[PDB]
Amino acid sequence: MTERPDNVPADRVFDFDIYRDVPEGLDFHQSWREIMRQAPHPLMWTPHNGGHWVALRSDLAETVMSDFERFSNHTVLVPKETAGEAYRLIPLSLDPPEHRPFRSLLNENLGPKPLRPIEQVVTDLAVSLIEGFRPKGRCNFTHEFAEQLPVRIFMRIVDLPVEDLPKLKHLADQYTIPLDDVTKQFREYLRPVIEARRIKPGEDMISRMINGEVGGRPLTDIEAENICIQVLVGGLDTVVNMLGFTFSHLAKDHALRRAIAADPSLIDDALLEFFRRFPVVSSAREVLRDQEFEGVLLKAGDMVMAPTVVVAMDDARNEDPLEFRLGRKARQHSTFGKGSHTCPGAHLARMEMKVVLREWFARIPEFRIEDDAPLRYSNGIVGSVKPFVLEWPV
Numbered sequence: 287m288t289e290r291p292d293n294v295p296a297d298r299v300f301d302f303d304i305y306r307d308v309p310e311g312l313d314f315h316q317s318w319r320e321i322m323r324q325a326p327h328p329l330m331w332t333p334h335n336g337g338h339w340v341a342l343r344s345d346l347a348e349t350v351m352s353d354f355e356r357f358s359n360h361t362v363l364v365p366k367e368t369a370g371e372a373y374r375l376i377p378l379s380l381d382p383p384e385h386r387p388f389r390s391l392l393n394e395n396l397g398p399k400p401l402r403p404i405e406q407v408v409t410d411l412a413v414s415l416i417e418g419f420r421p422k423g424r425c426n427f428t429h430e431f432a433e434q435l436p437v438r439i440f441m442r443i444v445d446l447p448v449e450d451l452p453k454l455k456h457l458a459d460q461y462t463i464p465l466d467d468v469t470k471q472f473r474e475y476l477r478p479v480i481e482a483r484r485i486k487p488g489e490d491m492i493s494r495m496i497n498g499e500v501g502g503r504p505l506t507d508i509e510a511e512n513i514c515i516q517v518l519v520g521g522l523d524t525v526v527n528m529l530g531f532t533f534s535h536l537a538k539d540h541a542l543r544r545a546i547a548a549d550p551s552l553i554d555d556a557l558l559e560f561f562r563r564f565p566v567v568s569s570a571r572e573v574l575r576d577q578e579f580e581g582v583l584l585k586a587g588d589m590v591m592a593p594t595v596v597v598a599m600d601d602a603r604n605e606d607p608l609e610f611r612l613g614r615k616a617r618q619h620s621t622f623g624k625g626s627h628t629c630p631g632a633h634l635a636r637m638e639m640k641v642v643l644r645e646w647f648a649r650i651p652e653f654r655i656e657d658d659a660p661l662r663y664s665n666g667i668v669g670s671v672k673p674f675v676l677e678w679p680v
């Protein structure tokens with residue numbers, strides 16, 4: 287809905303809304319592939335959401351994703367002058383070199399070692415939820431299962447009392463009640479906990495960050511609060527939506543479902559193919575300087591969207607990427623991004639998927655979409671299958 291600027295050839299104009307639903311009834315990733323296939327250039331421009339460029343080829347997307355010297359994490363959301371400014375929060379908004387010490391802190395604290403006890407936490411939660419609805423023979427998977435996981439897991443990582451789950455779920459939902467008021471509510475909740483752990487440190491992630499340094503100086507309360515929020519939100523819709531694609535797929539692909547049920551040792555490799563097959567995140571970058579790129583002039587202040595989606599779905603760099611194959615000898619993808627801002631929660635994401643797949647298949651080996659209804663999907667910063675119902679015998 288914005289005026290076409292003088293740095294945008296009309297040859298690169300296309301009708302793209304990252305918030306608009308997938309047309310009923312294409313497959314989410316198929317839809318994207320058609321957008322990629324119809325586009326006259328690898329880099330197109332859309333009047334929607336402030337007006338912004340979109341990288342529509344794999345190599346291009348990964349370049350914008352990773353080349354911080356030209357494309358900055360200063361704004362990552364569209365529209366830039368509403369959502370982009372609204373959600374800009376250090377250190378995720380930082381570029382290298384400044385982003386370096388924070389990246390280290392994020393990556394080490396969400397690593398395999400300090401997340402070791404989380405595995406039994408995910409196991410007990412998954413089991414309790416599944417045993418809950420198993421005798422009903424049906425469930426809304428997104429509301430009754432997927433959505434019940436990430437806040438509870440976050441809360442065990444940072445060691446917060448389970449009584450606070452509804453409060454925290456409500457804040458995270460309303461964050462993603464004016465926004466600035468939600469952030470204040472986040473800090474009013476988190477600051478006493480951080481201050482309590484400065485006095486009596488434990489082994490949780492807040493205590494670990496507190497006893498860490500970045501510039502050779504301690505973290506401030508502001509920085510630790512920012513990181514807590516970003517870690518809570520960062521693993522919420524991502525994990526819920528990923529689980530949605532995974533289980534709606536299993537529901538349809540009976541060949542795959544029956545193999546995994548009859549042989550759970552397939553889960554480790556199936557997992558790797560679920561992360562390749564179903565990229566969900568579309569992040570963007572801000573242009574800081576006038577730059578010649580892709581045969582056009584990128585003005586300073588321009589936004590460039592670089593979806594993880596266009597990476598693994600590019601058939602000029604991937605073999606039949608819509609096909610779900612356990613056989614795959616090559617599985618390159620950027621579902622977790624590329625560059626300094628590569629997802630530090632990727633280990634947690636894979637641990638969660640594994641436990642969920644293992645406990646689900648132990649208990650409900652055979653299931654499908656109720657009445658084998660068609661899937662419908664949404665786009666956004668995190669893509670999704672709209673809420674679906676699963677059914678199983680007894």
Ligand code: HEM
Pocket residue numbers: 351359362377378389392396516517518520521522524525528566567569594620621622623624626627628629630631632634635
């Ligand atoms: C299937 C699950 C997940 C997917 C697909 C995913 C995807 C991504 C992507 C694409 C990025 C890069 C954003 C960019 O280009 O700037 C990212 C970063 C990030 N993720 Fe994840 N994520 C997942 C799970 C998680 C979890 C479980 C956590 C936390 C426990 C988490 C926390 C974060 C944080 C804090 C960042 C920001 C890194 C930085 O900018 O320094 N994510 N994620």
